[PDB]
Design a binder for this molecule. Structure first.
Ligand SMILES: CCCCCCCCCCCCCCCCCC(=O)OC[C@H](COP(=O)([O-])OCC[N+](C)(C)C)OC(=O)CCCCCCCCCCCCCCCCC
Ligand SMILES: CCCCCCCCCCCCCCCCCCCC(=O)O[C@H](COC(=O)CCCCCCCCCCCCCC)COP(=O)(O)OCCN
Ligand SMILES: CCCCCCCCCCCCCCCCCCCC(=O)O[C@H](COC(=O)CCCCCCCCCCCCCC)COP(=O)(O)OCCN
Ligand SMILES: COP(=O)(O)OP(=O)(O)OCC[C@H](C)CC/C=C(/C)CC/C=C(\C)CC/C=C(\C)CCC=C(C)C
Ligand SMILES: *[C@@H]1O[C@H](CO)[C@@H](O)[C@H](O)[C@H]1NC(C)=O
Lengths: 56, 770
């Protein structure tokens, strides 16, 4: 049926799909941010570890 | 069906980008969807997918180039009939790689072939030069092996005299030249022709003469190449050039075989490549018309569609979704609209000719009475009323039947002949025209200008001598005489079917045929116009214009019937009433119609056709003139009332002017159209007289010969008669009658009910099949 109910259901499916796309983009960017944070933290902690090890 | 245009409706589709290409491809295959530009703000050359369309155009250019090389070669192009769909995924990369290979390889092949052919020709010229120089150095070569300077080359034959003269005139008596013809003429290094040649050897003294002769030969467009200085060098370089020539011949043959193989492979599928790339280009250009991510990641499409095909379009979208693999389904939605729907007529193979014929003068508006179904008969019939001839109709129907039968053959074998393509597209039109022309030729009792007499003429000549006052003396005394039906037995009733045969041989033929055919033309025209006015009433009823129905149609029909339908009634009544005995006082309907309009009923001259004619005709004229104010004054006043006194842009003066124009146009049009329908009689009489004069001037010559030797002359005389009938009559007179039936339908018949202010429905259907 091509009634208003069917049109609303199709529009709702489209809304759900766009929400899924946004959610997946957010998940990907969040993982990228977490890895970037981890690598930057490791770099800085290694740089300070150099000085600490040298002194001790 | 063909009665009126199909119910049309707008629709809009939401479809996710990933599946959008496949969905629109399914739509293209289906063919019942017409997209519209939804981003007209930005021109076509800047839209989103212009990169894709540009690359598709480049691919089409590549295919055109390869096809052109195919045509240049003798290789043929196959035809399978498959219509694969363009691959929605990025198969464009694979197709581009394939076509780039098929083009680059062919271009490299052509360039290398040209260069190697040039080298082969130069080397063969060098070989011939070496061989002939060895031949010249064979008087007595006692020594095995430097002041003298040496050159050799090749010249075009018959230039030897001029070249020798020029040498002996420039390097005055101080240079030697020997020449020898080269049998088996050779091909020019650059000029590219097979011409006879002479190999020549020149001896000279020093550097100045060397330069002189070198420049002289260069101007004489010869070619020199190096040459050996010792017999050992001659043998060595001759063997080298011979081996290189053989190697070059082998390489040439191999490369030509490679070209042939690759071109055969290309031609095996060139048509399928063309169809693939052409659809892909069309689909991307269509997606250009749709909204883009500037508003939403999901594509928006706007379309016209007939109401009945909405479910089919949804099913096509379902196929698109399944093929694309997208989980989300594309969704279609209706929406009440104001834009004008197009005109779609669901044309058929048989009705295509007639539909194009009626569309030529303007595509019908949305859902108005379509003149095609009635035209399907009335255009062949009006054509036959003029072209009426049994024999010519037989020829035309046989030709049309040949085209119909062999239509598949001609449809497959396409040619650029515009005239023949037009005729073939109209084959069914020509077939019906031939059939109705056969019928009207039977009615006229005409067959190549000669009647038939299949039932027996109603005119007996004997009662003239029996009851009448004739004798052989009167026959001797009168050159043409005449006949009368007043005496009892001359006229034994009307001929049961068609005009009586005796009129063919009667010198009084035209006197009767003119009147009969004029009355026939007027009758048919008036009835056609009345049918048109009734169709106009149908249009108004469907469109819900009671204003038009009550002012407009009804005044129009009353005016037309009272003035001109009464004329048809008068014609038929005179035919049924007045006979030979009342011939003397038989009135003239022309004069009676003039008097009807002029109110000039006289007390002298021809008497009244029937009792009460004065009163009835005065009443008819009064009603006719009253129908003019009826059309003019009423509708504007009611419009002004109900659209400016109620609810309170309407311009009363302009509305009055428009209605006055419409009324004047219609009223003058009635007269002028009833007049113009006389072109039926004009063209019929012209065709009949041209056929008669052709017969009497061509084959009367071959028939009016006492000697039996005339049977041989009839051969050529009838060849001329056949060619003349086909050219002057079947082609040109037939074309004139066809176009005048067309003009009648376009103006006289269709002005009553047709508007033709719509748009042809141009769907996104794949016609790239070409
Ligand atoms: C042995 C001889 C026997 C006698 C045979 C010939 C009889 C003489 C009369 C023939 C007249 C032919 C013209 C009518 C047929 C075309 C109408 C039709 O259906 O096509 C729609 C035509 C052509 O078809 P089309 O290409 O438009 O098809 C539609 C395609 N789409 C939808 C994609 C656009 O359409 C029109 O444009 C309509 C107007 C037609 C008006 C006709 C003008 C006169 C044409 C003269 C033809 C050449 C003269 C004869 C020369 C002969 C010598 C080779
Ligand atoms: C010589 C003296 C007589 C002259 C006067 C009569 C002349 C009549 C002229 C009409 C006869 C020819 C009709 C065309 C024949 C070819 C058929 C073409 C294809 C076809 O079947 O057409 C269909 C339309 O209906 C048709 O084809 C119509 C067929 C039935 C029509 C019936 C009316 C005939 C006239 C009145 C009765 C006879 C009177 C004379 C005795 C639809 O096309 P498709 O589905 O095949 O398309 C296929 C792709 N889409
Ligand atoms: C969508 C279609 C639209 C319509 C198309 C048709 C055109 C309509 C034209 C207008 C209306 C009809 C015609 C009216 C004018 C009079 C017609 C007279 C015809 C005629 O000659 O008949 C003779 C007179 O009849 C008489 O002697 C009797 C008295 C005179 C005639 C009376 C009126 C008859 C018509 C009635 C109206 C019909 C309406 C049709 C639409 C026969 O008489 P005769 O030879 O024996 O006599 C003679 C010795 N006295
Ligand atoms: O048979 P015959 O041919 O011997 O003669 P007929 O009388 O017995 O039969 C012929 C029957 C018919 C009347 C013959 C048809 C002949 C026509 C010449 C003219 C038809 C055209 C018309 C009615 C409109 C054009 C205007 C024309 C005169 C002017 C009228 C308009 C005004 C005055 C404003
Ligand atoms: C004489 O000729 C006239 C004129 O055609 C004819 O009406 C009449 O009957 C004839 N009379 C005879 C044959 O006695």
């Amino acid at each position: 049926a091509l009634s208003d109910a069917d049109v609303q259901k199709q529009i709702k499916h489209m809304m759900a799909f766009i929400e899924q796309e946004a959610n997946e983009k957010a998940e990907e960017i969040d993982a990228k941010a977490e890895e970037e944070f981890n690598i930057e933290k490791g770099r800085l902690v290694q740089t300070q570890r150099l000085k600490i090890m040298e002194y001790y | 069906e063909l009665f009126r245009s199909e119910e049309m409706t707008l629709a809009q589709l939401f479809l996710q980008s990933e599946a959008a290409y496949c969905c629109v491809s399914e739509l293209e295959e289906l063919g019942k969807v017409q997209f519209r530009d939804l981003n007209p703000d930005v021109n076509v050359f800047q839209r989103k997918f212009v990169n894709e369309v540009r690359r598709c155009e480049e691919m089409d250019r590549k295919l055109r180039f390869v096809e052109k090389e195919i045509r240049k070669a003798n290789i043929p192009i196959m035809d399978t009939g498959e219509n694969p769909e363009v691959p929605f995924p990025r198969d464009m990369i694979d197709l581009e790689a394939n076509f780039e290979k098929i083009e680059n390889e062919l271009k490299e092949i052509n360039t290398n072939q040209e260069a190697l052919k040039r080298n082969f020709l130069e080397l063969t010229e060098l070989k011939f030069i070496l061989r002939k120089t060895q031949q010249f150095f064979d008087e007595m070569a006692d020594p095995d092996l430097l002041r003298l300077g040496f050159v050799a080359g090749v010249i075009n034959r018959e230039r030897i005299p001029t070249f020798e003269r020029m040498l002996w005139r420039v390097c005055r008596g101080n240079v030697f030249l020997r020449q020898a013809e080269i049998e088996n003429p050779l091909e020019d290094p650059v000029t590219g022709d097979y011409v006879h040649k002479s190999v020549f050897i020149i001896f000279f003294q020093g550097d100045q003469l060397k330069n002189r002769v070198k420049k002289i030969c260069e101007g004489f467009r010869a070619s020199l190449y190096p040459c050996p200085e010792t017999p050992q060098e001659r043998k060595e370089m001759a063997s080298g050039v011979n081996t290189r020539i053989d190697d070059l011949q082998m390489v040439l043959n191999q490369t030509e075989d490679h070209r042939q193989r690759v071109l055969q492979a290309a031609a095996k599928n060139i048509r399928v490549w063309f169809i693939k790339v052409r659809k892909m280009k069309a689909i991307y250009h269509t997606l250009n018309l749709c909204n883009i991510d500037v508003t939403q990641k999901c594509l928006i499409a706007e379309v016209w569609c007939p109401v009945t095909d909405l479910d089919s379009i949804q099913f096509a979208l379902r196929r698109g979704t399944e093929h694309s693999g997208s989980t989300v389904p594309s969704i279609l939605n209706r929406m009440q609209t104001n834009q004008t729907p197009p005109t779609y007529n669901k044309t058929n193979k048989f009705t295509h000719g007639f539909q194009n014929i009626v569309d030529a003068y303007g595509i019908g508006t949305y859902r108005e009475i379509n003149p095609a179904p009635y035209t399907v008969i009335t255009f062949p019939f009006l054509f036959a009323v003029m072209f009426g001839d049994f024999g010519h109709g037989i020829l035309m129907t046989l030709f049309a039947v040949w085209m119909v039968l062999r239509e598949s053959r001609i449809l497959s074998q396409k040619n650029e002949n515009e005239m023949f393509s037009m005729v073939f597209s109209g084959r069914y039109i020509i077939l019906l025209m031939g059939l109705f022309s056969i019928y009207t030729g039977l009615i006229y009792n005409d067959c190549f200008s000669k009647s038939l007499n299949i039932f027996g003429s109603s005119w007996s000549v004997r009662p003239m001598f029996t009851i009448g006052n004739w004798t052989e003396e009167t026959l001797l005394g009168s050159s043409v005489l005449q006949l009368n039906p007043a005496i009892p037995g001359v006229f034994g009733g009307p001929y049961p079917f068609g005009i009586d045969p005796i009129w063919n041989i009667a010198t009084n033929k035209l006197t009767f045929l003119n009147s009969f055919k004029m009355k026939m033309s007027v009758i048919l025209g008036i009835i056609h116009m009345l049918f048109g006015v009734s169709l106009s009433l149908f249009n108004h009823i469907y469109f819900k214009k009671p204003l038009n129905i009550y002012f407009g149609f009804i005044p129009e029909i009353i005016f037309m019937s009272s003035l001109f339908g009464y004329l048809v009634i008068l014609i038929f009544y005179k035919w049924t009433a007045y006979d030979a005995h009342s011939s003397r006082n038989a009135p003239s309907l022309l004069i009676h119609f003039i008097n009807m309009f002029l109110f000039s009923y006289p007390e002298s001259g021809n008497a009244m056709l029937y009792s009460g004619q004065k009163g009835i005709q005065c009443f008819l004229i009064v009603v006719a003139m009253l129908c003019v104010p009826w059309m003019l004054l009423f509708k504007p006043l009611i419009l002004r009332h109900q659209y400016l006194r109620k609810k309170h842009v309407f311009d009363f003066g302009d509305t009055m002017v428009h209605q006055a124009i419409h009324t004047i146009e219609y009223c003058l049009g009635c007269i002028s159209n009833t007049a113009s329908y006389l072109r039926l009689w004009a063209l019929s009489l012209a065709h009949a007289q041209l056929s008669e004069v052709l017969w009497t001037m061509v084959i009367h010559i071959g028939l009016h010969v006492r000697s039996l030797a005339g049977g041989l002359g009839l051969f050529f005389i009838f060849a001329a008669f056949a060619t003349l009938t086909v050219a002057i009559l079947l082609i040109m007179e037939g074309l004139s009658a066809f176009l005048h039936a067309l003009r009648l339908h376009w103006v006289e018949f269709q002005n009553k009910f047709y508007t033709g202010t719509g748009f042809k429905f141009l769907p996104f259907s794949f016609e790239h099949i070409r």
